[PDB]
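Exercise 7. Given the components listed, write out the predicted structure of the assembled complex. Treat all entries as one system.
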Amino acid sequence: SDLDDVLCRHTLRLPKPASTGQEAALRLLSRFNGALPSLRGQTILAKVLSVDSERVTVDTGYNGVAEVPRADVSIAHVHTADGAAPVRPTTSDVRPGDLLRLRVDAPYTPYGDMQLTAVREESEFKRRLAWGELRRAMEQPVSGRVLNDCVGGFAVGVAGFVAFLPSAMAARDTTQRVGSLQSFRIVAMDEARRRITLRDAGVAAAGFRRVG
Amino acid sequence: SKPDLVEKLLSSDVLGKGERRRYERQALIREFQRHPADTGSPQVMVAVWTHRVR
Amino acid sequence: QLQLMQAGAAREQAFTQAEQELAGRLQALRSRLLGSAATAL
Amino acid sequence: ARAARYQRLLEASRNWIRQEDLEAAINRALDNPEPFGFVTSLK
Amino acid sequence: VAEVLEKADYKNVAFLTRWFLSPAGRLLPRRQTRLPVAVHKHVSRQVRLARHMGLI
Amino acid sequence: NNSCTFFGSIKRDVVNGVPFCLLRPSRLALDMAKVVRNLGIVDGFEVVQRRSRLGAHDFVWLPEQQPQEPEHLYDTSLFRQR
Amino acid sequence: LEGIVHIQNTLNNIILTLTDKQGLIKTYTSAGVVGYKGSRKSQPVAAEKAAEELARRALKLGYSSVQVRLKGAGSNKQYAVTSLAAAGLTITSLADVTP
Amino acid sequence: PLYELLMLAKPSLPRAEMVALIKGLGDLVYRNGGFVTSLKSFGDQHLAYDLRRPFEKYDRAHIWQMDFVSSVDAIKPLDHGLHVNNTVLRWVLVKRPMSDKSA
RNA sequence: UGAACACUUUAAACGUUGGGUAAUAUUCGGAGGAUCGGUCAAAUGAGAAUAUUCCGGAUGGAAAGCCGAAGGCGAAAGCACCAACAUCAGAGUCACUAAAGCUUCAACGCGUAAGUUUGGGUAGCGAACCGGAUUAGAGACCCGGGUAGUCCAAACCGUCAACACAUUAUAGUAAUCUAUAACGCCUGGUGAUACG
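Answer.
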């Protein structure tokens, strides 16, 4: 696994517009790690250095020091290495020395730094959640508020996103209880057109074939 | 009957005469060569050019 | 996938073997992400 | 590959219709109209 | 989005009214498709044939 | 023509600050490059090839397995666009 | 009665037209119709006077209602439609017909 | 080279002669050593715009497609075949590759 | 290097033939009875016979309106309705060829647009000729009708801030970084027009 990876690096090191000698240890030590092969939007383990009232000083290791507003920071992003959110008496006592879970939005600004903000965009949490759950249909319900009716179904504001449940996967009593919160199940989304498809969790998932 | 339809498809009768003259152009390359499949000797060059100008 | 490539097999069979041989950390991660999902909501 | 083109043109030469039964093919195609509201696929 | 078969040469109304035709009898330009520009130009040619066709 | 091309490319990259000088090789370019490496005007030369347009298998320049210094044109015109 | 209206506005002149449902046209009203010429015709008041006139004419016509079909990109045309709504002669329909 | 023809047809005639019109075009491509692959209509569609500035025929027009393999010599008779008949208005003839990737 | 073949990929490359069009002014009957045109602003006229318009019909050819863009193809000028014929071209892969390569003195072709000879008739466009305007005269700018020409097919002309003002080609990483190969041109300004 080591030798085959090294020879894969050397074999792809061939066919380049220079002779490129004395630069293969560069790729060897790149391949163990030092940078991850796709960056934009990928969450990291980052180190908090100091916390002020507003701006928190967090390591990047990639362009120096990161800056996040503290009013977005919770204890939920404090990635302990054991699997639990840490037992702390308050909810934003991020002591410097912990490992923090933040997303790089860009690696470089106009202003010398990166963005690197886990914004605690709850809508983006539901975006990553429901996109992963679209994948995870192959491998628990989601709450929504029904708002108004029209042709073919009911309008559901699910977790900050407005969807529209079709008539076939709809329950009957959702007609007579419009306005209250109840749980629903995701089916799919169409990202090119912004249409989100749901169902009632009491309505059984009879197989909609993947029209692609 | 259907194989007769296939051989009337695969004939050179149906093609556009760009493609018909290109097929007889590799017929000429099979003629003029010194060799089995020589396509760049100058005899091949002048054979192609003389037929082309005709 | 790449070390199965230079072993001699083609790309898609390597992708399938990589799906079998590293899926366990994927369900561990999706359990962790559902835990973070219940944490945030 | 020329043999494969020969093979898939010989085996798909039924729907490729014959000259003698033009009239019956017209009468066996006019009987059913064809969908146009959404996009037609291949064939 | 860029599934070539049924979109590359096909002049029928569905794909173009979905993603290629502006509502007022007009077309959707290059900036409103986010598609490879030569392939976009050829299917724009196909659509613009289809604005000469009896359909549209 | 190859002498003036050699010394012109020397004049080129000296006044342009490029410390590598890369020529279409010949008998002259190889031999007189060995001359100016021998007198120490430069520190060395190697044949290189624009390896991006090498084929699925052309012959390729292995620096280690080849002996260190070519001394004729035919060994340096075997390959493609050195 | 039922009428159809075509409104055309040009920088020199603004026109509101009173016409039959069949679209046969009884009349067309313009800033020029109110006699404004050039810049006054350009001015909003000239369109408004034709609009007041069109409403008075529609009542004389006895068409309580005339559909209004708008035409042209002009500002003066906009004043005229408003003046009529303020006027209260009631459009059989209000719509934009520009081609 | 197989040739699609998404050509128009008169809207509501009794079908006793439009079928005969396609028999005539089938006879025309029947000659010259080639034949139709499939004759797929679309029934009828009302059109998008009026045509025939003389006589004002109108929309609601009929649709037919030929899909015939032909040597290039037969096109000029096909041009006469689509030009002389006043029951048809427009005709679009397109080349298609030898993968038989038709419409 | 230069060139021909087999695939991959290219579109406003080129000429011919058939069909179309938002849109155009003229016209045949009908709605409707004084405005339209137009401009910083004013002025001949359409019109008491019916104007802008509006209905629906005919005419006939211009131009390809959006697409479509610090986009493409071209040797350059240039090239922007399709469909088909049609002849290329250019790039990449994979193979042939072993200097047939570079430049162009001379010669010779291409050559936007005007202009002339020939044939007609013509949506729109826009020199004359008459009419009015900022001003003292106004010949122009601008309002107003509008003829050759712009349209077609054949010929002649060949000149120009026809510019990358960046010669062409090779060799280096899109040059004005610059060695060379053949070139073409300049030699202070005003004076290039007249002859041949």
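Discussion: The longest helix of chain C spans residues 23-40. The two ends of chain C are 36 Å apart (CA to CA).
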